[PDB]
Design a protein around this ligand. Structure first.
Ligand SMILES: COc1cc([C@@H]2c3cc4c(cc3[C@@H](O[C@@H]3O[C@@H]5CO[C@@H](C)O[C@H]5[C@H](O)[C@H]3O)[C@H]3COC(=O)[C@H]23)OCO4)cc(OC)c1O
Ligand SMILES: CCCCCCCCCCCCCC(=O)O
Ligand SMILES: CCCCCCCCCCCCCC(=O)O
Ligand SMILES: CCCCCCCCCCCCCC(=O)O
Ligand SMILES: CCCCCCCCCCCCCC(=O)O
Length: 583
């Protein structure tokens, strides 16, 4: 270490890990360079590291990895005739140089769009050359998602490897592999969204706010930890996320490790759930810790009434350090309720703060704040209720028919939203319902928050680049804790004038009967949205008349001898019979 940084990295990571991350880091700076140029780089940088491992005292093995990596970047021939002013970065000395590079990372690289080949082609390529097949895609994905934390992209890639291993040698390859690839896309996109949103919220609402979130989240997970310990961890976590949000891989990676090193050295004073994690190699340590089970909460804890309502010096302890008092509230409440969403805890916190502001200025303070815990009852109520009604609805309808209810619901509220956006969000919102409703009671709200936070921002980002309704603009710019209830408060837009008829949008062709089940579902769900937008004032019964008449139709023509003639003449009368009903 420090004698040869590059030799130390290599030893800690291993050759295989080393060459994987470097390909990632190279594909994340030079997004336009072809695969094989990157290969040649990764090969040159690894063989070099080897010499340093064998002989740390060698030629320039004492340089920082920041210098080595930069030197390699400015090797690339058409740096100027391809990446433009990025070549100018090479004239700058190292501290400034890397910053110049980060500033030229493109989230909109304007690359094409990865097509997923046939399972046959995939499994053949995978077998006939794993190395090239896998690293080509690692490269192809990393270049499209720069800023995506490199070691995280690596963990997904390893999960792609097992999937391709188990399934290519299966009876029905396609039926084993396709659902996994889809799950992996969804988790990976959800990963990058959660990273994106954390930096955005930090940039928008501030450090103190992030800290409030932190205390909440941490006390839930490490309830046996003392407040002084949770408080330091909150401070430490804020530092690593702040720095990790600057965008540089080595700064982030080293901060994450130190924090993993600390925690693991103090598990006794943190959680009894950190044993297997703290055994893992450096690459996996913080990744493991970040997803650790909740430690069980201390046997028998007193009510919060004593320290927060009854005590003789509430208003005093509050008056000294307000944020400290408010965080202790958070601490004591979060550790007791791992079944609460973090934002909900922040609302009870917000409410406790307000009443304290009013009530501590009273001639007899305890009088006016003695009932404050009675306002928490309806704030806790609202989320708890919403999962019951939604999970019930789902449990008796199944995922696909459950998304179709959301489809109609949200098209009726915000019909100005583009059709594919409505299909994408309503389908997504159904999956978090299929994910979290399978968890038991006390895990539902924390889970629903986790994926709602993703799907909600996803939609906000579209609407930011393309706004079409102000009540959505308002729900997206409202506070952190107000975001979701704002959306739940969306009402049916009955001032929306019906979209005009277009026989194309309701013309169905015989290709549907062969299309993949996912592919096929989008088609129908696209038409459903369009059915609502054309006739939003129709009843549940009117709607279900048409959705049934259509099911019959497709059943008939998809088993006909001449399927294309059937889809033409029968869809011709299907549309007419239906216009007539909703006329
Ligand atoms: C401290 O100031 C800086 C902030 C940043 C950005 C950044 C900036 C943002 C923001 C979000 C982000 C986010 O970008 C990424 O965007 C991608 C958008 O498409 C999805 C698919 O994938 C996203 C990445 O996964 C996400 O991680 C940050 C995470 O890693 C960074 O460093 C990113 O929302 C508000 O403004 C860079 C800097 O370098 C000069 C800074 O100095
Ligand atoms: C610039 C190319 C070489 C990059 C080598 C460093 C790659 C990440 C180091 C892994 C540290 C992981 C720390 C953690 O997340 O817990
Ligand atoms: C969107 C389809 C339903 C998904 C499952 C039900 C979600 C109910 C809302 C949960 C809200 C938790 C976040 C919060 O308390 O602010
Ligand atoms: C604003 C665009 C309309 C399409 C999606 C609407 C999303 C509403 C989010 C509601 C999340 C909680 C579900 C619920 O409150 O029942
Ligand atoms: C205006 C004429 C429309 C006639 C056809 C409307 C069909 C709307 C989509 C039907 C979706 C059915 C859902 C399903 O069966 O999976």
């Amino acid at each position: 270490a420090h004698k040869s940084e590059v030799a130390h990295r290599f030893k800690d990571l291993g050759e295989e890990n080393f060459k994987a991350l470097v390909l990632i880091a190279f594909a994340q700076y030079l997004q336009q360079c072809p695969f094989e140029d990157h290969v040649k780089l990764v090969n040159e940088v690894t063989e070099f590291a080897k010499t340093c491992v064998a002989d740390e005292s060698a030629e320039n093995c004492d340089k920082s990895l920041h210098t080595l990596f930069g030197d390699k970047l400015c090797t690339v021939a058409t740096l100027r005739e391809t990446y433009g002013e990025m070549a100018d970065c090479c004239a700058k000395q190292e501290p400034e140089r890397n910053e110049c590079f980060l500033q030229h990372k493109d989230d909109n690289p304007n690359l094409p769009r990865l097509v997923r080949p046939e399972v046959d082609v995939m499994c053949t390529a995978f077998h006939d050359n794993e190395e090239t097949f896998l690293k080509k895609y690692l490269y192809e994905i990393a270049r499209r998602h720069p800023y995506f934390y490199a070691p995280e992209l690596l963990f997904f890639a390893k999960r792609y490897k097992a999937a391709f291993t188990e399934c290519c040698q299966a009876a029905d390859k396609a039926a084993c592999l396709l659902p996994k690839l889809d799950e992996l896309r969804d988790e990976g996109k959800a990963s990058s969204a959660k990273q994106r949103l954390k930096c955005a919220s930090l940039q928008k609402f501030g450090e103190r706010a992030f800290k409030a979130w932190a205390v909440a989240r941490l006390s839930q997970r490490f309830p046996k930890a003392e407040f002084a310990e949770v408080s330091k961890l909150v401070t430490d976590l804020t530092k690593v996320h702040t720095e990790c949000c600057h965008g540089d891989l080595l700064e982030c990676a080293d901060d994450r490790a130190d924090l993993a090193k600390y925690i693991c050295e103090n598990q006794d004073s943190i959680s009894s759930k950190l044993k297997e994690c703290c055994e893992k190699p450096l690459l996996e340590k913080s990744h493991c810790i970040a997803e650790v089970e909740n430690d069980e909460m201390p046997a028998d804890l007193p009510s919060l009434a004593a320290d927060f309502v009854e005590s003789k010096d509430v208003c005093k302890n509050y008056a000294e350090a307000k944020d400290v008092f408010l965080g202790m509230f958070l601490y004591e409440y979060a550790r007791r309720h791992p079944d609460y969403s973090v934002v909900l805890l922040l609302r009870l916190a917000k409410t406790y703060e307000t009443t304290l502001e009013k009530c501590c200025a009273a001639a007899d303070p305890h009088e006016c704040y003695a009932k404050v815990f009675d306002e928490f009852k309806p704030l806790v109520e609202e989320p708890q209720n919403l999962i019951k009604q939604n999970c019930e609805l789902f449990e008796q309808l199944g995922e696909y028919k459950f998304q179709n209810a959301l489809l109609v619901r949200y098209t009726k509220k915000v019909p100005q939203v583009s059709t594919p956006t409505l299909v994408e969000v309503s389908r997504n919102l159904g999956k978090v319902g299929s994910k979290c409703c399978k968890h038991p009671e006390a895990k539902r709200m924390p889970c629903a928050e986790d994926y709602l936070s993703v799907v909600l921002n996803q939609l906000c980002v579209l609407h930011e680049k393309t706004p079409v309704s102000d009540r959505v603009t308002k729900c997206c710019t409202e506070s952190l804790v107000n975001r979701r209830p704002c959306f739940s408060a969306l009402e049916v837009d009955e001032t929306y004038v019906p979209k005009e008829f277009n026989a194309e949008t309701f013309t169905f062709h015989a290709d549907i009967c062969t299309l993949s089940e996912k592919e096929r579902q989008i088609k129908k769900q696209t038409a459903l949205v369009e059915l609502v937008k054309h006739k939003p004032k129709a009843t549940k019964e009117q709607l279900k008349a048409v959705m049934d008449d259509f099911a019959a139709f497709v059943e008939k023509c998809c088993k006909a001898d001449d399927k294309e003639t059937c889809f033409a003449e029968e869809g011709k009368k299907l549309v007419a019979a239906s216009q007539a009903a909703l006329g």
